[PDB]
């Protein structure tokens, strides 16, 4: 039984590999060599935030490109006004080690979590004005890595227990749970349709789960090391994955394989975040070399470098409209570039 | 300048006041990371340091300064990822069952893994060989010998510069010093001075438990201020 099942699994893996190789008519480079060059993208710092106390370990852009949520390792969430630089909201968290934060698409709820294994969603438009604990949901036997809002009543979360889960705000329980991975899930990324979302874990693989049914429609198994960041393409047909090997990989849902591997010899420090622009040409990724890079999703050439920070960059995010890009590092300073 | 913008600026200034008031305490605090397997007596240590939650924070004041010890015993076995967030902490207290020789190998493996970590490379790792009475009773009974697990224990001579405590049997002293020597060898390996180990023999009832944390963190901060300020 066990031996027959192992042999069948190996045969299925070999068949999937052969099918993926057959569809690999050519690499993205051969087709992205005719497109005109993107040139150097020299982004300058337009804003400088000096409110955070501890290492910034999360960030996200809500429906409005003016408010920016950022979480610090001291258990503090801060909603900044990107334009005026003012502090729109300050939320003290009961958990000091917060590693994830997201801004609901309605601008009324903000999620957070971390080593506490309890996802806390606070409401910003409460009649009482002050920030109140809207839903402190638990059930995951592991640290929370990332959070993303799907609507004003549901929220997807990934925990260190290797299992992601979509919870309901009103009910405060798992609307659905996905099968466990081989390692701890470290990042999440929602698709523009909100129906599917791809997630990577410590294991060198990324699974594309569905919100309707708890099943990974696709499972890419192409990485050197532990994936630490993942981002969805603005269209929803591809997605970038970044690990600690200092190499990003752009996988495709239609082709079901890697398109181009963004890597360089002079870059040896791992990656911590990945993000795209409103168009997708500029792929932004923060590296452990105390800086961020911006490559061409098509040409794969180094388009820009951001070395304003002084500590290891922790997270970065592009606005929904693409006017600027926020970057939070361990230097307790968040910088907006444009 | 609009009035709403001025009110928002005033609210931001108040939030900055509060953030500075909190950062004062933050900077003035000392974060400690308690690590240890299930067999380790970390629970007994937390119970003694009284001067689905994957994190447990415990604040205790010693010599008029606070210490926030963080225990993590409700998470998955592997800890190569969530351990990175605990950088820049004051110290790391590793617990090990010095009496149970069976789990000593896994304890040393975990200690070496936590020491050679790339992110915690510059973080000191304090060591409390808890459960000393059990180890003494075991080595005195003679039913369990460390030689069965470690052959070097058969060809290991008692340190000449040792400091046997009053009333300790030669076998107990030799065993504890061999354990300490093994730990110091595993620590100094690729240490480079940026981080050094602090082993201390902790009993199960010794009230002078947080005092060890204080004395270790004092030297840790002393070396950190000698290095950063270019005096060593």
């Amino acid at each position: 039984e066990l031996d027959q099942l192992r042999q069948e699994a190996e045969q299925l893996k070999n068949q999937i590999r052969d099918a993926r190789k057959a569809c690999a008519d050519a690499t993205l480079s051969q087709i992205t060599n005719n497109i005109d060059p993107v040139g150097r993208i020299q982004m300058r710092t337009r804003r400088t935030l000096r409110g955070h106390l501890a290492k910034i370990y999360a960030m996200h852009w809500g429906t409005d490109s003016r408010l920016l949520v950022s979480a610090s390792q001291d258990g503090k969430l801060i909603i900044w006004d990107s334009y005026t630089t003012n502090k729109v909201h300050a939320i003290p968290l009961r958990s000091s080690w917060v590693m994830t934060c997201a801004y609901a698409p309605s601008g009324n709820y903000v999620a957070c979590g971390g080593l506490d294994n309890i996802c806390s969603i606070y409401n910003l438009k409460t009649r009482e004005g002050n920030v109140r604990v809207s839903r402190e949901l638990a059930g995951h036997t592991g640290y929370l890595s990332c959070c993303r809002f799907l609507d004003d009543n549901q929220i997807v979360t990934s925990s260190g227990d290797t299992t992601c889960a979509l919870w309901d705000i009103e009910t405060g329980q798992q609307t659905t749970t996905f099968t466990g991975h081989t390692g701890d899930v470290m990042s999440l990324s929602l698709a523009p349709d909100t129906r599917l979302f791809v997630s990577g874990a410590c294991d060198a693989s990324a699974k594309l789960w569905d919100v309707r049914e708890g099943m990974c429609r696709q499972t890419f198994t192409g990485h050197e090391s532990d994936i630490n960041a993942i981002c969805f393409f603005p269209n929803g047909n591809a997605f970038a994955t970044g690990s600690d090997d200092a190499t990003c990989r752009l996988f495709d849902l239609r082709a079901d394989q890697e398109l181009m591997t963004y890597s360089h010899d002079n870059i040896i420090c791992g990656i911590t975040s990945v993000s795209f622009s409103k168009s997708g040409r500029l792929l932004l990724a923060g590296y452990d070399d105390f800086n961020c890079n911006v490559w061409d999703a098509l040409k794969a050439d180094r388009a820009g470098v951001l070395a304003g920070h002084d500590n290891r960059v922790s997270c970065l995010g592009v606005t929904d409209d693409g006017m600027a890009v926020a970057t939070g590092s361990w230097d307790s300073f968040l910088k907006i570039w444009n | 300048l609009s009035a709403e913008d001025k009110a928002a600026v005033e609210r931001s200034k108040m939030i900055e006041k509060q953030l500075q008031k909190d950062k004062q305490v933050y900077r003035r605090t000392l974060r400690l990371l308690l690590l240890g397997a299930d067999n380790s007596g970390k629970s007994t240590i937390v119970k003694q340091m009284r001067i689905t939650s994957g994190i447990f924070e415990t604040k205790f004041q010693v010599d008029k300064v606070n210490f926030h010890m963080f225990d993590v015993g409700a998470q998955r076995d592997e800890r190569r990822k969530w351990i990175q967030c605990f950088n820049d902490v004051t110290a790391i207290i590793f617990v090990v069952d010095s009496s149970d020789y069976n789990r000593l190998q896994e304890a040393l493996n975990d200690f070496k893994s936590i020491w050679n970590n790339r992110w915690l490379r510059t973080i000191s790792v304090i060591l409390f060989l808890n459960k000393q009475d059990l180890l003494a009773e075991k080595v005195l009974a003679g039913k369990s010998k460390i030689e069965d697990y470690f052959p070097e224990f058969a060809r290991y001579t008692t340190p000449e510069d040792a400091t046997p405590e009053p009333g300790e049997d030669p076998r107990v002293t030799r065993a504890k010093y061999f354990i300490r020597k093994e730990f110091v060898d595993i620590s100094t390996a690729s240490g480079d001075g940026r981080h050094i180990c602090y082993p201390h023999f902790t009993c199960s009832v010794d009230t002078e438990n947080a005092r060890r944390i204080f004395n270790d963190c004092k030297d840790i901060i002393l070396q950190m201020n000698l290095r950063e300020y270019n005096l060593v």
Partner: single-chain antibody, 230 residues
């Protein structure tokens, strides 16, 4: 959320009085307070404003010197001490909460207020003061201003307050952006000079006085107010 005012009554000329306001159901310190007066058979008129933490205070050019506002945060209370009360001071005073930030709705909750009887800023002028209309039809109230409220930032500093018989003014619009707790029937349009409040379907609860307010500059000034009756 409640703002209970007290201290009103009859006062002789030249006297003094401390009007108190107890706030509950929210963080009193987080919301700036505004004392606004309404004369009998007339519209509203801003009096004083105190920011959070008492870091900033403002008064109207006509009320400076006499009235002084203060706030006790430990007790979540507001106080307004008036001295040398004149004959014109006869009016009903209301305490209003307002928090200022992107996406907020300043002046969202109006207190019940208390009546006290005796014995170059931007001006808002409305065309019509009373418009007869029955349920089922739509209403279009107009408003004119002497200075363009469109600031360089692009925010429309226009506030609409609906005061019903026996109730306090209720916020309808704070910036086209509908206010909280108000149905979608009310809408706002216009440029920085002219403004229009449109009600698509009238109801029995819509009868009342609609007042317009500008917030470009700290010194405020309410309009005459347009009345809608059955």
């Amino acid at each position: 959320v409640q703002l209970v005012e007290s201290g009103g009554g009859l006062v002789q000329p030249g006297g003094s009085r401390k009007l108190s306001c107890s706030a509950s159901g929210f963080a009193f310190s987080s919301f700036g307070m505004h004392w606004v007066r309404q004369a009998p058979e007339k519209g509203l008129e801003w009096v004083a404003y105190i920011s959070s933490g008492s870091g900033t205070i403002y008064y109207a050019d006509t009320v400076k010197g006499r009235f002084t506002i203060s706030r006790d945060d430990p007790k979540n209370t507001l106080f307004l001490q008036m001295t040398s009360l004149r004959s014109e001071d006869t009016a009903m005073y209301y305490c209003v909460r307002s928090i200022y930030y992107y996406g907020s709705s300043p002046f969202d909750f109006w207190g019940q207020g208390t009546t006290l009887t005796v014995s170059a800023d931007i001006v808002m002028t409305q065309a019509t003061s009373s418009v007869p209309v029955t349920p089922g039809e739509s209403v279009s109230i107009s408003c004119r201003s002497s200075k363009s409220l469109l600031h360089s930032n692009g925010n429309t500093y226009l506030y609409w307050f609906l005061q019903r018989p026996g109730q306090s003014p209720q916020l309808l619009i704070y910036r086209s952006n509908l206010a909280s707790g108000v149905p979608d029937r009310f809408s706002g349009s216009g440029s920085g000079t002219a403004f229009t409040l449109t009600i698509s379907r009238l109801e029995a609860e819509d009868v009342g006085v609609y007042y317009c307010m500008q917030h470009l500059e700290y010194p405020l000034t309410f309009g005459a107010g347009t009345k809608l009756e059955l």
